[PDB]
UniProtKB/TrEMBL annotation, chain A:
<feature type="active site" description="Proton acceptor">
    <location>
        <position position="248"/>
    </location>
</feature>
<feature type="domain" description="Siroheme synthase central">
    <location>
        <begin position="119"/>
        <end position="145"/>
    </location>
</feature>
<comment type="pathway">
    <text>Porphyrin-containing compound metabolism; siroheme biosynthesis; siroheme from sirohydrochlorin: step 1/1.</text>
</comment>
<keyword id="KW-0597">Phosphoprotein</keyword>
<dbReference type="InterPro" id="IPR035996">
    <property type="entry name" value="4pyrrol_Methylase_sf"/>
</dbReference>
<dbReference type="InterPro" id="IPR012409">
    <property type="entry name" value="Sirohaem_synth"/>
</dbReference>
<dbReference type="GO" id="GO:0051266">
    <property type="term" value="F:sirohydrochlorin ferrochelatase activity"/>
</dbReference>
<dbReference type="GO" id="GO:0032259">
    <property type="term" value="P:methylation"/>
</dbReference>
<feature type="binding site">
    <location>
        <begin position="43"/>
        <end position="44"/>
    </location>
    <ligand>
        <name>NAD(+)</name>
    </ligand>
</feature>
<feature type="binding site">
    <location>
        <position position="400"/>
    </location>
    <ligand>
        <name>S-adenosyl-L-methionine</name>
    </ligand>
</feature>
<dbReference type="InterPro" id="IPR014777">
    <property type="entry name" value="4pyrrole_Mease_sub1"/>
</dbReference>
<keyword id="KW-0949">S-adenosyl-L-methionine</keyword>
<feature type="binding site">
    <location>
        <begin position="22"/>
        <end position="23"/>
    </location>
    <ligand>
        <name>NAD(+)</name>
    </ligand>
</feature>
<comment type="function">
    <text>Then it catalyzes the NAD-dependent ring dehydrogenation of precorrin-2 to yield sirohydrochlorin. Finally, it catalyzes the ferrochelation of sirohydrochlorin to yield siroheme.</text>
</comment>
<keyword id="KW-0808">Transferase</keyword>
<feature type="modified residue" description="Phosphoserine">
    <location>
        <position position="128"/>
    </location>
</feature>
<feature type="binding site">
    <location>
        <position position="371"/>
    </location>
    <ligand>
        <name>S-adenosyl-L-methionine</name>
    </ligand>
</feature>
Length: 446, 450
């Protein structure tokens, strides 16, 4: 260790930045975020500085560097393109024992600016002393994905609870467990973020009433079409705190490889049975994640699985996912809309009735068929027997977003035979947008 | 942010600790190993202080607080159990603009001391600013079993190569591509952890020899509808490593806080073709450009128009899909887009009226579908009249979702004869959902009311 990390309180403390370019502007936005009383001294300023000044948010000293601007300063940052001026800044700062950063030169100054993950009042700082800015940014990117966006509001609210928790929990280890379920209750977190104070002390009273051991809830999490990188940040965070993950065939191996190490897995690849599995594994008092392919509310039966938790008292929440249409669209180079090609996008299945074929053949649509292969020969002639132009571009996307995605494409008179070249899970896309794939194909065809 | 973390260079710089017991000893060990010139001022001391002075590690001043001992100091720590003395020390340090910690009073004074995960020379610092010491500790634990122990040898080796890297690579973009490959090479990390120097050199020399691709790239990234948690892992990865982010008014501020702090940001908020060339000209300067778009880039996003010039131009590009507004607003309002058999199909429609076209209303009025109008607010009264006149029943439930997934989300709902009225009560950005699924809202609404 050759740097000591400290967390400085800068609110209304005099700080100085020397420089007025893009680099200084980024440091000024950091110091403004911390509430510093900011003076910025430069030969000239880019417009973002004069707008900041015209709003009373900092002070501008236009002109050469003047040492006396350090007279009552706590922090100094040299952010000019001129090594000579930066060296005069840092020398003037060192003889005044003002900690100083030189943006181009981390070893030439008395402090180094770390990568910051901001969950105020909780904060994480990562640095390797200027030996590795890229590693720092990589660790920041990781920490940013693991730390829920509203953890800071739980942190702030916990401090307003330290009393009421010791008064009802007289054991160290008992209180260690109350905080442990308190800080991962992200319903309470979102409840605080939304300023829905009826639902806060509702969740709060639940945290003191129910036993410590019981933290029961169900989260519907959309896994996306397969590529593990298409899981949402919130999805990952829920999967990392789950006591039990209920998943099915359509959730990819890559996503499951992200599940908590010490989490129980239930594989369910009849629909009524899945509903019961969710309920009383949540009535066991366990934090349950129901992982589903794509988006849980688009042909996922997510509606059916939650309504069982309704008259049952089990709290739930829903993390949306990248539906198959969106993923296959991006990864095949076929936009679902484009200029005037399509006034609407149609997400359609292929039980409970029969399809309206006149409707689907109407012009200016992008049609996206889910679960359609078993009717792909039927779809073909039924569309051209209801007016659809026989040359309509058509494409099929199998295992979209995955490392084994296959895209076969062509024209509506070939949909039947093209459909034999692909297996479930596949998507059928019909509309002029298909013809754009020749310009926008960037992913690998297998 | 209520604190600014900084990593201070304490070598040969004067620091003062007031107080002489166990809490002071723990802070003094931290400052000795940071390399500081340490003076300790206390009425009473414990053993390790008096050996350290005999061992020449520090200077002891036995007696009451002496504020003149701060005259040359850069940092001060008040670590007595007497809160009156601690306050004198912090008042004396403040008047000299010396950052000061009062150990038992995190909310007072001017810097707090974080808990540290040490990888030498990598370091992660974490604090809740005293507001919740328990959360800090649980987070330390997760970060620990997340940062591999030998990350420090990789970081230490990077620092030894930095002068070689700055010489052989002229531009900063090629230096970045070297580091990105460098920090993800698992064989290099394991060869370092073995002091296997022939293996470290074989891989290092191959890494320097790799002809670096010099083109830039354009990445369309779907921000999702607003909640920063609905950004994808890959979308976060692209903006955490971008050079320039070109972003909309419909990208939320929370997502903009996820953008690489050292990337610059071009705003384009309400020209479709100045955007196309801003991307092109900024890309093949050699830099990674992220075009960050609200929702999903290929659903009413004109993402196709932005990419179509690049292929014939020789510019690589990719697309990261996002959570389209229909999905986000469905999940966050408790209105599933499909359910059992309420809906055979979902229709995402542009409620905008291109100055020449008109929607096909008989088509949209059909039964057993969920209609979702994008940018349809200012024509909501026309949508009401047209759907009704083409056969949709008057009691069809509708909902308008404004700022869906944000903490400012509002949802108003009713039947189709209210749609025109209901739209007067929200502003953009808002979605219109028409269909039987809207009635499920009272059974599936988890997010809030507002
Ligand atoms: N990775 C993928 N590639 C292509 N189609 C997929 C897919 N994943 C799911 N699908 C489509 O979705 C159907 C399952 S229905 C479940 C859909 C899921 N809730 C979603 O939002 O995507 C499959 O028959 C297939 O047509
Ligand atoms: N957070 C939000 N809540 C409700 N509607 C939203 C929204 N964000 C975008 N929209 C809708 O989207 C329209 C812009 S069109 C761009 C949509 C984006 N490409 C996507 O896939 O979602 C707006 O007029 C509004 O109708
Ligand atoms: Cl670093
Ligand atoms: Cl478009």
């Amino acid at each position: 260790m050759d740097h000591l990390p400290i967390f400085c309180q800068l609110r209304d403390r005099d700080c100085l930045i020397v420089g007025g370019g893009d680099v200084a502007e980024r440091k000024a936005r950091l110091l403004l975020e911390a509430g510093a009383r900011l003076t910025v001294n430069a030969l000239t300023f880019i417009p973002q500085f004069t707008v900041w000044a015209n709003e009373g948010m900092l002070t501008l000293v236009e002109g050469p560097f003047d040492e006396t601007l350090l007279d009552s300063c706590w922090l100094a940052i040299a952010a000019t393109d001129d090594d000579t001026v930066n060296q005069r800044v840092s020398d003037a700062a060192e003889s005044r024992r003002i900690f100083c950063n030189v943006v181009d030169a981390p070893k030439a100054a008395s402090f180094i600016m770390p990568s910051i993950i901001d969950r105020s009042p909780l904060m994480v700082a990562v640095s390797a002393g200027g030996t590795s800015p890229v590693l720092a940014r990589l660790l920041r990117e990781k920490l940013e994905s693991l730390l829920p966006q509203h953890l800071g509001q739980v942190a702030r609210y916990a401090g307003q609870l330290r009393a009421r928790v010791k008064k009802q929990f007289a054991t160290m280890g008992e209180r260690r467990r109350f905080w442990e379920k308190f800080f991962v209750n992200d319903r309470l977190a979102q409840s605080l973020a939304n300023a829905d104070e009826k639902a806060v002390n509702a969740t709060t009273e639940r945290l003191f009433s129910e036993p410590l051991d019981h933290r029961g809830e169900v989260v519907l999490v959309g896994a996306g079409p397969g590529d593990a990188g298409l899981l949402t940040l919130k999805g990952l965070q829920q999967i990392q705190q789950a006591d039990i993950v209920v998943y099915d065939r359509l959730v990819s191996d890559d996503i499951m490889n992200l599940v908590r190490r010490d989490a129980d897995r239930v594989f369910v690849g009849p629909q009524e049975e899945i509903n019961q599995i969710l309920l009383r594994e949540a009535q066991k008092g366990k934090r349950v994640v129901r992982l589903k392919g794509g988006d849980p509310f688009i042909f996922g039966r997510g509606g059916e699985e939650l309504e069982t938790l309704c008259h049952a008292g089990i709290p739930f929440s829903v993390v949306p996912g990248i539906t198959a249409a969106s993923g296959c669209s991006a990864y095949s180079g076929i936009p679902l809309t484009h200029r005037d090609y399509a006034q609407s996008v149609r997400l359609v299945t292929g039980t409970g009735g029969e399809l309206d074929w006149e409707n689907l053949a109407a012009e200016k649509q992008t049609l996206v068929f889910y679960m359609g292969l078993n009717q792909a020969a039927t779809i073909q002639e039924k569309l051209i027997a209801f007016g659809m132009q026989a040359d309509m571009p058509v494409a099929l996307v199998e295992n979209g977003t995955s490392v084994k995605q296959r895209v076969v494409h062509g024209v509506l008179t070939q949909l039947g035979e093209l459909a034999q070249q692909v297996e479930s899970p596949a998507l059928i896309i019909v509309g002029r947008v298909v013809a754009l794939r020749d310009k926008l194909n960037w992913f690998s065809n297998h």
